[PDB]
């Protein structure tokens, strides 16, 4: 069959950050598992929060609020910084 994962994309991100260094096998497995866990937690929190707000208007604000309420200040604030810049560049 076929499998889908973030090998090439994470490698590209690292090359942008550290071109000389790569990613090893189990280190990639660890990173992929952690990023999947983070995505699933954010998605579940956004879904249950939107259900709590009794409105079917799920914006980037749902993911933003999730990021605030599941992750400490530093990483969340920097992520929202870069996400705001990326969104206003796309928009």
């Amino acid at each position: 069959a076929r499998k889908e994962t973030y090998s090439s994309y994470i490698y590209k991100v690292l090359k942008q950050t550290h071109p000389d260094t790569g990613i090893s096998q189990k280190s990639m497995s660890i990173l992929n598992s952690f990023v999947n866990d983070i995505f699933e937690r954010i998605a579940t929190e956004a879904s249950k929060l939107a259900a709590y707000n009794k409105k079917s208007t799920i914006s980037a604000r749902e993911i933003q609020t999730a990021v605030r309420l599941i992750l400490p200040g530093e990483l969340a604030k920097h992520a929202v910084c870069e996400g705001t810049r990326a969104v206003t560049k796309y928009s």
Partner: protein, 76 residues
């Protein structure tokens, strides 16, 4: 197999934005929360080699080289 995945991603990048009444964020959005400190992309910091670890825990050949060799270097 990355080409077909990228094509599927590009195709799906337009279906999700027209799934009913969305009108995302009212075409506006709050700026960088608190203060802007993300830098360009990262922090650009490193770590040391010596007892700096013993300074770090006070501030708060993996699985053998055969397994270090076992983990194949990824090729895109």
């Amino acid at each position: 197999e990355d080409s077909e995945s990228d094509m599927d991603d590009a195709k799906l990048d337009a279906l999700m934005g027209n799934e009913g009444e969305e009108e995302e964020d009212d075409l506006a959005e709050i700026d960088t929360c608190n203060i802007i400190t993300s830098g360009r992309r990262t922090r650009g910091k490193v770590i040391d080699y010596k007892k700096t670890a013993e300074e770090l825990d006070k501030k708060e050949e993996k699985e053998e080289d055969d397994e270090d060799e076992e983990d194949d270097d990824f090729k895109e």
